[PDB]
Design an enzyme around this catalytic site. Sequence first.
Site, PDB file in Angstrom:
ATOM      1  N   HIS A 294      17.233  12.538 -44.280  1.00  0.00           N
ATOM      2  CA  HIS A 294      16.324  13.240 -43.396  1.00  0.00           C
ATOM      3  C   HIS A 294      16.701  14.722 -43.274  1.00  0.00           C
ATOM      4  CE1 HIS A 294      13.762  12.934 -39.492  1.00  0.00           C
ATOM      5  NE2 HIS A 294      13.061  13.338 -40.534  1.00  0.00           N
ATOM      6  N   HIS A 295      15.746  15.603 -43.546  1.00  0.00           N
ATOM      7  CA  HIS A 295      15.977  17.038 -43.434  1.00  0.00           C
ATOM      8  C   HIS A 295      16.971  17.530 -44.476  1.00  0.00           C
ATOM      9  CE1 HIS A 295      13.480  16.887 -39.973  1.00  0.00           C
ATOM     10  NE2 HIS A 295      14.374  16.334 -39.171  1.00  0.00           N
TER      11      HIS A 295
ATOM     12  N   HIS B 292      20.077  25.430 -34.948  1.00  0.00           N
ATOM     13  CA  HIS B 292      19.495  24.102 -34.878  1.00  0.00           C
ATOM     14  C   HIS B 292      19.634  23.311 -36.180  1.00  0.00           C
ATOM     15  CE1 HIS B 292      17.280  20.783 -33.307  1.00  0.00           C
ATOM     16  NE2 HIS B 292      16.388  20.863 -34.278  1.00  0.00           N
TER      17      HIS B 292
ATOM     18  N   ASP C 108      19.494  17.790 -29.455  1.00  0.00           N
ATOM     19  CA  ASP C 108      18.330  16.918 -29.565  1.00  0.00           C
ATOM     20  C   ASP C 108      18.360  15.850 -28.469  1.00  0.00           C
ATOM     21  OD1 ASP C 108      17.307  17.504 -32.763  1.00  0.00           O
ATOM     22  OD2 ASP C 108      19.385  17.907 -32.319  1.00  0.00           O
TER      23      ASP C 108
ATOM     24  N   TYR D  62      11.200  17.328 -26.096  1.00  0.00           N
ATOM     25  CA  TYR D  62      10.290  16.589 -26.995  1.00  0.00           C
ATOM     26  C   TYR D  62       8.897  16.377 -26.407  1.00  0.00           C
ATOM     27  CZ  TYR D  62      14.052  15.678 -30.313  1.00  0.00           C
ATOM     28  OH  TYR D  62      15.071  15.820 -31.228  1.00  0.00           O
TER      29      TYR D  62
ATOM     30  N   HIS E 265      19.314  18.734 -35.072  1.00  0.00           N
ATOM     31  CA  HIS E 265      18.173  18.509 -35.953  1.00  0.00           C
ATOM     32  C   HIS E 265      18.170  17.121 -36.605  1.00  0.00           C
ATOM     33  CE1 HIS E 265      14.533  19.588 -37.905  1.00  0.00           C
ATOM     34  NE2 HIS E 265      15.051  19.758 -39.110  1.00  0.00           N
TER      35      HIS E 265
ATOM     36  N   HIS F 162      19.219  13.341 -36.565  1.00  0.00           N
ATOM     37  CA  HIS F 162      19.564  12.461 -35.451  1.00  0.00           C
ATOM     38  C   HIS F 162      20.730  11.537 -35.797  1.00  0.00           C
ATOM     39  CE1 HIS F 162      15.138  13.199 -34.143  1.00  0.00           C
ATOM     40  NE2 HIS F 162      15.937  14.143 -33.679  1.00  0.00           N
TER      41      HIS F 162
ATOM     42  N   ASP G 254      16.260  21.388 -29.512  1.00  0.00           N
ATOM     43  CA  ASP G 254      15.394  20.236 -29.265  1.00  0.00           C
ATOM     44  C   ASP G 254      15.667  19.638 -27.905  1.00  0.00           C
ATOM     45  OD1 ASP G 254      14.034  20.657 -31.559  1.00  0.00           O
ATOM     46  OD2 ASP G 254      14.862  18.919 -32.659  1.00  0.00           O
TER      47      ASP G 254
ATOM     48  N   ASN H 106      13.300  23.125 -33.551  1.00  0.00           N
ATOM     49  CA  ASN H 106      11.922  23.054 -34.033  1.00  0.00           C
ATOM     50  C   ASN H 106      10.938  22.417 -33.035  1.00  0.00           C
ATOM     51  OD1 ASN H 106      13.345  20.617 -34.822  1.00  0.00           O
ATOM     52  ND2 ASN H 106      11.431  20.024 -35.855  1.00  0.00           N
ATOM     53  N   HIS H 107      11.433  21.594 -32.114  1.00  0.00           N
ATOM     54  CA  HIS H 107      10.565  21.036 -31.082  1.00  0.00           C
ATOM     55  C   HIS H 107      10.216  22.031 -29.972  1.00  0.00           C
ATOM     56  CE1 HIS H 107       9.833  16.810 -32.185  1.00  0.00           C
ATOM     57  NE2 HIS H 107      10.908  17.004 -32.930  1.00  0.00           N
TER      58      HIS H 107
HETATM   59 FE   LIG Z   1      15.488  16.586 -33.046  1.00  0.00          FE
HETATM   60 ZN   LIG Z   2      15.137  19.375 -34.850  1.00  0.00          ZN
END
Ligand SMILES: [Fe+3]
Ligand SMILES: [Zn+2]
EC number: 3.1.3.2
Lengths: 425, 426, 423, 426
Positions: free
Chosen positions: B289-290, B280, B129, B161, B317, B319, B158, B195-196
């Site tokens: 988160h996630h 990822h 990321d 971005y 994924h 952060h 990632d 995913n980005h």
């Molecule tokens: Fe990310």
């Molecule tokens: Zn991600």
Amino acid sequence: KNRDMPLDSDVFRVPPGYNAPQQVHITQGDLVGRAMIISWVTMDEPGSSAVRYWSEKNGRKRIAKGKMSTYRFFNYSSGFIHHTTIRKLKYNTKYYYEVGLRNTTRRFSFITPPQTGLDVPYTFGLIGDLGQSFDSNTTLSHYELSPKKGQTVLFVGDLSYADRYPNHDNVRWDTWGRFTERSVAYQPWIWTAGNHEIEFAPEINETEPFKPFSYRYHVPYEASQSTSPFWYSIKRASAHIIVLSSYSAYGRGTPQYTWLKKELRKVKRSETPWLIVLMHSPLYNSYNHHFMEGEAMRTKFEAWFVKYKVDVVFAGHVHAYERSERVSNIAYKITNGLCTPVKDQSAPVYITIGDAGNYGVIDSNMIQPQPEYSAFREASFGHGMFDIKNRTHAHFSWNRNQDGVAVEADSVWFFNRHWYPVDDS
Amino acid sequence: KNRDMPLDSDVFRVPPGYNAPQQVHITQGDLVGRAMIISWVTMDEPGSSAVRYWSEKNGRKRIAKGKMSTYRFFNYSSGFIHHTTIRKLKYNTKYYYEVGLRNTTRRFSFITPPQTGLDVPYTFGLIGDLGQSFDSNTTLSHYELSPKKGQTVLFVGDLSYADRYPNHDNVRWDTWGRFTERSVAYQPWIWTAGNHEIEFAPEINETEPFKPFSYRYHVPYEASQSTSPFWYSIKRASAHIIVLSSYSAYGRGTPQYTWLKKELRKVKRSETPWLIVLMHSPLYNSYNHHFMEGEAMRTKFEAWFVKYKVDVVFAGHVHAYERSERVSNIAYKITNGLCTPVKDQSAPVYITIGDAGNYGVIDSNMIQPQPEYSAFREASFGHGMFDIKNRTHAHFSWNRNQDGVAVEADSVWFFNRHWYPVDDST
Amino acid sequence: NRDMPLDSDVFRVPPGYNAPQQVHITQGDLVGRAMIISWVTMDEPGSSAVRYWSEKNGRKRIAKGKMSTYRFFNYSSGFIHHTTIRKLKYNTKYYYEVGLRNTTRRFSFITPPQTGLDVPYTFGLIGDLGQSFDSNTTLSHYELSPKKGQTVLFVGDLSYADRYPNHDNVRWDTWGRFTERSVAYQPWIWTAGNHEIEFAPEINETEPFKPFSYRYHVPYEASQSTSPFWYSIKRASAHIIVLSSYSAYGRGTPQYTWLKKELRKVKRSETPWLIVLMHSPLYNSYNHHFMEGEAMRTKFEAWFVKYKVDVVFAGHVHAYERSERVSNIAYKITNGLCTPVKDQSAPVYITIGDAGNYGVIDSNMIQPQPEYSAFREASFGHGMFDIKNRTHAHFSWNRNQDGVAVEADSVWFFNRHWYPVDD
Amino acid sequence: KNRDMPLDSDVFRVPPGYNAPQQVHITQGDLVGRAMIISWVTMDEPGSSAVRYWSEKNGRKRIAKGKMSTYRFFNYSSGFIHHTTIRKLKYNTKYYYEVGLRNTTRRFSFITPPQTGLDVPYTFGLIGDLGQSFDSNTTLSHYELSPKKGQTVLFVGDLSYADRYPNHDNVRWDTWGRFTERSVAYQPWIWTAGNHEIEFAPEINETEPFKPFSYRYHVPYEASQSTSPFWYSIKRASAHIIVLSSYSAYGRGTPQYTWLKKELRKVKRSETPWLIVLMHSPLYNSYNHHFMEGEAMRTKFEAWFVKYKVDVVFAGHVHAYERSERVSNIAYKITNGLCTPVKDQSAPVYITIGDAGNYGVIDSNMIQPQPEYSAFREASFGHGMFDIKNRTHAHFSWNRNQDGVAVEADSVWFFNRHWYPVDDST
Ligand SMILES: [Fe+3]
Ligand SMILES: [Zn+2]
Ligand SMILES: *[C@@H]1O[C@H](CO)[C@@H](O[C@@H]2O[C@H](CO)[C@@H](O)[C@H](O)[C@H]2NC(C)=O)[C@H](O[C@@H]2O[C@@H](C)[C@@H](O)[C@@H](O)[C@@H]2O)[C@H]1NC(C)=O
Ligand SMILES: *[C@@H]1O[C@H](CO)[C@@H](O[C@@H]2O[C@H](CO)[C@@H](O)[C@H](O)[C@H]2NC(C)=O)[C@H](O[C@@H]2O[C@@H](C)[C@@H](O)[C@@H](O)[C@@H]2O)[C@H]1NC(C)=O
Ligand SMILES: *[C@@H]1O[C@H](CO)[C@@H](O[C@@H]2O[C@H](CO)[C@@H](O)[C@H](O)[C@H]2NC(C)=O)[C@H](O[C@@H]2O[C@@H](C)[C@@H](O)[C@@H](O)[C@@H]2O)[C@H]1NC(C)=O
Ligand SMILES: *[C@@H]1O[C@H](CO)[C@@H](O[C@@H]2O[C@H](CO)[C@@H](O)[C@H](O)[C@H]2NC(C)=O)[C@H](O[C@@H]2O[C@@H](C)[C@@H](O)[C@@H](O)[C@@H]2O)[C@H]1NC(C)=O
Ligand SMILES: *[C@@H]1O[C@H](CO)[C@@H](O[C@@H]2O[C@H](CO)[C@@H](O)[C@H](O)[C@H]2NC(C)=O)[C@H](O[C@@H]2O[C@@H](C)[C@@H](O)[C@@H](O)[C@@H]2O)[C@H]1NC(C)=O
Ligand SMILES: *[C@@H]1O[C@H](CO)[C@@H](O[C@@H]2O[C@H](CO)[C@@H](O)[C@H](O)[C@H]2NC(C)=O)[C@H](O[C@@H]2O[C@@H](C)[C@@H](O)[C@@H](O)[C@@H]2O)[C@H]1NC(C)=O
Ligand SMILES: *[C@@H]1O[C@H](CO)[C@@H](O)[C@H](O[C@@H]2O[C@@H](C)[C@@H](O)[C@@H](O)[C@@H]2O)[C@H]1NC(C)=O
Ligand SMILES: *[C@@H]1O[C@H](CO)[C@@H](O)[C@H](O)[C@H]1NC(C)=O
Ligand SMILES: *[C@@H]1O[C@H](CO)[C@@H](O)[C@H](O)[C@H]1NC(C)=O
Ligand SMILES: *[C@@H]1O[C@H](CO)[C@@H](O)[C@H](O)[C@H]1NC(C)=O
Ligand SMILES: *[C@@H]1O[C@H](CO)[C@@H](O)[C@H](O)[C@H]1NC(C)=O
Ligand SMILES: *[C@@H]1O[C@H](CO)[C@@H](O)[C@H](O)[C@H]1NC(C)=O
Ligand SMILES: *[C@@H]1O[C@H](CO)[C@@H](O)[C@H](O)[C@H]1NC(C)=O
Ligand SMILES: [Fe+3]
Ligand SMILES: [Fe+3]
Ligand SMILES: [Fe+3]
Ligand SMILES: [Zn+2]
Ligand SMILES: [Zn+2]
Ligand SMILES: [Zn+2]
């Protein structure tokens, strides 16, 4: 043991006449029922993709123009595949339609559904994992002979089982098309993609998933802003039907995930009170065969189904019948020990109906004893009927191949989750 | 809130000269290390896809021929993208290569790995990321200044971005390419799709998943008999690296599922004792988160990782940084109540390393209290190093952006699961 | 009518699962160090790899090619393979095998000598072959020739499949199996004729040359052509230019542009023999197709004279003809200069489209025989262009009704650059 | 020497407003005039390909949905090109239409031709080799100010002359589109492909003949069963117009040859009395420039034109004006000496009208003395009008840029070859 019907069986007979259209089949062609996708194959030459049609009410013959395509799979070369959409049909009216306008014409008919509405009745057939064995033939007969009179089939996947043959001998798709015609030429079948449609065979350089299925069976996917034929939505009568793909990506952010999220938000229970989900692989299954395969999709979507109060989820894949209680298993958080399904009047009923015949083998081995989440299960060949009466009531029944066509071995009233959330246990 | 480096930043400067190659990057081009994929962009005109190269020893200058491609995304039109594979290289040797042969030549270099082998040392950087914020630039600097000296980056997804910008402004792919150059032009980065990279945007009629990414970044996926760029494996030194796609199908009978099942059977621990998986989305993650996004993939593959004694699974994924204990949660059967992760010496360690900078935000909210399966977690920016010493020992460390480039805020010895399966808990 | 029946011996299918059939080869590069290997498998895709090695010593190598398929109406092709073997040695015999996966078949060819001023070589001339009994005879005569052809220059109209219902493309498959006995062992240089166009909008087939262009590849990029329908190659002491009568050739079009540029590249001191191939004859005194060549003639004739082309071979007319060396390039609409005159800088025009077609000869000729026509006869047969050295080439025409050693017409070509004597 | 209008000329102005449609142009969309192809470019984003249209009569606003495309040429990338067909229109009706429905809408109008019929009057403009020089601008002005009121332009090829610029700078296609909008947005121009549209540029890997032209300008070729945009037929009012391709194949058995043979059979002079043929390269031409380039096509089609009694053949290519006598040259048999054109009342008049301006150069070198087959010739810039009165009479006039917009420097009455076959010599 081979229980597939021989190539020379009566159900596989080729319609006579030069370039006679065959494998004729129809499905809904738009979001709300005013259109119909007409599909068929010609074997002798491309032919015309035009469909002639007229209503009994008006008797004015019209022409719709479509498209022809072909494919190859290994050393098989397909015939000429036609897909044509008739549009702007009147609701609740009988149409005749003709295909093969250039050489050998064949005529069929269908009835458009009533306009969508809150209390609009409709009877759906449920068929899964049909195949082309003698059992498959018996199930199809029971369905067409039902006094309940099914108006549209909801098909939960595994069509031809062509992939069980050497090199997936695609001739066995052609036979399946000729066999199913007697029903699907006259009423739409709503298609779900199962694992036998994947046809991923890198060993013979066939690496595009769903290729034969996707060339032969089209769906109105753009009508619901889906970007793929493997997940999509239709509205028919009082039902909003969401078709999902067990064998596509459904991780967060993927096309199918994004589409389902938005689609559930678009559902209006004051317009189509019955919310129905189709998928091939069952989220709840207490049979030994494919035990727990549904787990991955369950962790992604089950909470959405409960939140949006899906009425019912239909699946196949297991070659037997099962009906769950209204349950959810959505409280789990890795360390809180909450991994047992509980009663939840907000959840759908999960029905497994993959018992139409396949290649003649029933899944009889069950995890014992029957778990709490399982209401009824039985290893028998058969099919289901989901008969909607009005916004609050729908009657589901299961008919067994070994029973009279009018006999229901299982039946239960669904009380609608939005309009009548009373314990229908 | 906008912590992205501005367009006129020094890291985004355009290399001077007519049609000068830019956004140069390389990655392993084959299964075992004898090939390199060389990639770059030219803006003024198509130009040559030819790559000149030579070892600093011998010095016989050779030419490799590649392919040029372009793409459009909404109202964006790419420059000319070149991918060329150099093959049949010598192990453990420095090569010089040059691109822009027709007009403005630029020269770079890389060092091929040693041949694969049981006791071959090697140092991998772990970056996830990244993005292009000021934090991103800091993480990159720390990596390149590490005394440990990373020889290859395993990138857990990632990248740029760009999809955060209006219409995914693909200019921000170009800037990320130029910002990277300083690193991935001299050592391979092994790409994982995050995913980005999906860039699913039906609202502007861009519906093909991974399009911009898949045009700009090629991987040697046919080398491991994968049918897709998004899952594949490579061998490098003593490591066997499996790259998976969190955002592709992994149901039973799917291509990726099928591929992975077969691929695990090909693993030979007497030749590559370190079995490493990249993906990822984390299968173990105790941040809010996630939280539990990895559950679906976990139900499919976790038991496989334990069966084959994977040493370590890296993901991004979230952060932040996390390191699990060696645990498994693979005994569940719906009604048996066996749903708690237990200590399992056959299981991989799961590391979340998605804290290289993204767009400048950290994930600090954590499940309380820290679960038993979680060994260490911290919400700070940084990167990791996985430093293989031999068939029994690898040393992993995490370096924070707020610390000196030589400080390890967390560090641990991996004892190989095949050759030395002893409790290595911290 | 006169086409050999499907069960003919010549159309026989090589035995064995997925045995390669319709094997054929042609020059694969500009100067002779490459060869295009093509074949068809019917049972399954199979491999496009070719194994090859030189008779001398012979390390075995593998070349990898590409597989393709096509449809034409209700016909679906087998699996077509094309593979280029490169960097071969000059003047050496090679063996090659195809169908490595199941049924392997082995063949051979001999690479030409390196190009040169005085390098000898013998070219067969064959046009409008088809698959009638006449066709089979012509092929026999060529292969039984004492002069020994080393490469066939084919001036167009191959299978005449387009005469069948829906151009029954099975008739392309049979032609392939028919010709194999020759073209698997030596290159044929392909020219596109009108029976290759296959423009059939009535059955929705509207891409010109479709079947031909899938089955028969040519090394057109090697001469910077942007189309397979025009290109050049060099072989021994010849520079050979292949043109397309049924493509555009207006000023500024790709073919016109390519030709103008290609002529500037001819080096008569490396390849003294400058040969042009085209399907439709610029000079023709038969009634059939009389003057069809005029359009191309008005565009290219002055160029052929300017660059002193030695000889122009064409087919299309189902007969034999040889012109004098004449030119008709002085006409300016109103100046009355419209008769061909002797011109020692001009090529000789030879019509040689009499290899059999579908069994019919063109026998109706313009009377009396025009000045520009040196010799003409309505008989089936084939030609031979036998280069001795930079000054002398011997051309001969063999009739199907004669013995294989008999030459009904025969003439010395005196090279236009090195020996421009009246011949 | 450079006489092309500079980029910032008033005529090249960009219409104001976000994603404002530009380079709007229309042409007949069917065989008989009940359809129209609407074309335009958007520069900012794809936009909508929908056209809103209604008659001045009722209207009854309707939408037609079109298609969007783009191309690259070397280092040029196009804006978004829209082509949309409006069908089932009323004859002899003024229609309004709008494009750019999503952001900045622009409104235009056209008048459908009257139904085809024996005595239907109609005025065709004739323009060839327009380009974008100041001369080009003067010609267009004279056409639009003409007292005769042109209703449709027959365009004999050589559009933008973009190919004269470095790498064919395709920006000069965009300018030419903006320049000609003021006419072709309101009435169809009927396109002929000229040599400047070929754009064969292998040296920069552009090898597809007519690429830019074919992307930007669409014709209703399927309506006449042609298989290519480059040859096709339309009927409009009392005229049957056949468009041919000088730079496509036309040998015996080729698509264009086969198509033209069959098209001439379909002509019915009892329904459309005026038979008009358009092609770029003149079959008859007494200027030195491009002298005799038309000979190849003449040999193929001339006899056909005589056999079917074509009224008039229009061409450009030569930058000047010429009008032939009715002549034929079709008795030649190589050796018989019959190679002089002769008077043939059964033949078309051949007119060269490629003098609209190009890049500012006129062709003034003529073969002297003027040949018998040439009626009138002059080296001036200008345009023609073919003004059909009824089934027997049509008035052709030639207007020079140096004259008043009302002055006719050459003028002749055509007697219809079918309905009034009498010598109409001047
Ligand atoms: Fe990310
Ligand atoms: Zn991600
Ligand atoms: C399939 O239908 C076609 C018409 O839709 C037939 O073509 C037609 O045959 C007619 C015989 O009655 C003939 O007059 C028509 O001109 C022709 N129409 C066309 C070609 O558009 C076709 O008939 C066959 O093919 C034609 C061309 C002839 O060869 C006939 O002898 C054939 O029977 C029908 N095909 C078959 C095999 O029935
Ligand atoms: C909606 O559909 C239901 C199922 O058909 C209706 O219930 C049925 O109503 C019949 C009288 O119309 C009665 O004889 C049946 O026993 C009954 N079926 C079942 C399974 O309960 C339902 O009718 C309403 O609700 C039922 C329970 C009774 O209270 C009726 O008097 C009501 O009309 C239908 N609802 C409506 C609004 O019609
Ligand atoms: C693999 O690398 C490890 C770290 O370099 C080796 O362990 C180390 O051995 C050092 C002396 O060689 C000793 O001072 C260090 O304490 C120790 N480091 C750690 C973190 O354990 C390892 O060497 C083998 O195993 C260790 C446990 C000792 O028994 C050594 O004597 C052994 O050589 C290396 N393993 C191999 C097989 O090379
Ligand atoms: C496609 O490939 C198949 C083999 O991979 C063909 O079947 C094989 O045909 C052999 C004779 O050529 C036969 O001995 C083998 O039993 C058989 N292999 C298998 C696994 O069935 C197949 O052939 C068609 O069907 C077979 C049964 C024979 O009737 C052939 O004559 C047929 O061509 C191939 N199919 C096609 C359409 O080419
Ligand atoms: C090129 O080959 C020609 C054909 O073989 C040579 O001509 C032949 O030379 C023979 C002596 O070896 C002689 O008997 C024949 O008369 C003659 N054949 C013909 C058809 O003329 C030719 O030799 C040159 O040119 C001829 C005209 C004579 O002057 C010879 O003495 C010459 O050697 C060969 N030319 C060259 C450059 O070798
Ligand atoms: C067809 O159009 C012609 C050109 O407009 C008509 O000719 C013109 O008629 C005018 C009065 O109608 C007359 O003043 C013009 O001099 C004349 N123009 C020419 C070039 O001849 C023509 O009219 C018929 O023929 C002419 C010669 C007159 O005799 C008229 O009275 C006739 O009607 C038009 N034909 C018809 C049938 O209207
Ligand atoms: C053609 O060659 C391939 C590769 O060598 C063989 O695998 C084929 O063998 C046939 O198919 C395989 C999958 C296996 O069933 C074997 O028993 C078969 O013989 C071969 N094909 C044939 C028909 O020989
Ligand atoms: C194709 O069509 C013809 C009829 O036009 C038929 O007779 C022939 O057998 C067909 N060939 C096929 C289906 O391969
Ligand atoms: C299939 O079922 C139908 C309808 O019951 C019957 O008529 C037919 O004989 C059956 N065919 C086979 C092969 O079982
Ligand atoms: C990024 O870091 C590099 C290396 O430390 C430095 O040279 C540069 O100034 C930094 N750029 C920005 C915009 O932070
Ligand atoms: C294209 O290339 C030319 C030089 O070849 C350059 O001068 C021009 O600015 C370029 N145009 C674009 C927009 O790339
Ligand atoms: C064709 O020619 C060959 C060679 O002479 C001969 O062997 C074969 O039998 C002939 N076949 C036919 C059918 O003419
Ligand atoms: C083109 O002509 C128009 C109309 O005469 C005029 O207004 C405009 O200024 C001219 N543009 C030029 C000459 O650049
Ligand atoms: Fe099944
Ligand atoms: Fe012929
Ligand atoms: Fe011009
Ligand atoms: Zn299944
Ligand atoms: Zn011919
Ligand atoms: Zn021109």
